[PDB]
């Protein structure tokens, strides 16, 4: 069979990552309600649960 | 007339509002954006000659 016995899923490699994730142009930035801001720009936001990853 | 000083130490103190960690992160994200720069005059501004 040569190929791995179940298709991989997870994160992504650098070649896919650069074809995804093109720079985001945010017009009228921070205009809406909180809870609809682009929160996953924030480098320590735990996007699974709308909370920010502390040290504790 | 003989006055003198010595400095033994300098320390920097700083105090933080204990703001809720996702709220402060929501404020931070708003203030890191080029539409929202902080700005200030010299509070009684002139060129002094």
């Amino acid at each position: 069979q040569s190929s791995s016995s179940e298709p991989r899923s997870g994160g992504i490699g650098t070649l896919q990552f650069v074809e995804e994730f093109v720079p985001s142009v945010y017009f009228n930035p921070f205009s809406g309600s909180p809870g609809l801001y682009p929160d996953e720009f924030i480098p320590n936001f735990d996007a699974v649960r709308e909370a920010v990853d502390g040290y504790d | 007339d003989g006055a003198s000083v010595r400095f033994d130490s300098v320390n920097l103190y700083a105090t933080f509002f204990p703001m809720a960690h996702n709220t402060a992160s929501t404020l931070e994200a708003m203030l890191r954006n080029d539409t929202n720069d902080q700005s200030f005059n010299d509070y009684l501004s002139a060129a002094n000659m």
Binding site: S33, P34 | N41, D42, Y43, L44, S45
Partner: peptide, 22 residues
């Protein structure tokens, strides 16, 4: 001669303070 600051006031809501969309 030149003091200034952001101001378009509101008090505490029926919630009073801190939760900040109407």
């Amino acid at each position: 001669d030149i003091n200034f600051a952001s101001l378009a006031p509101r008090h505490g809501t029926r919630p009073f303070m801190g939760t900040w969309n109407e």
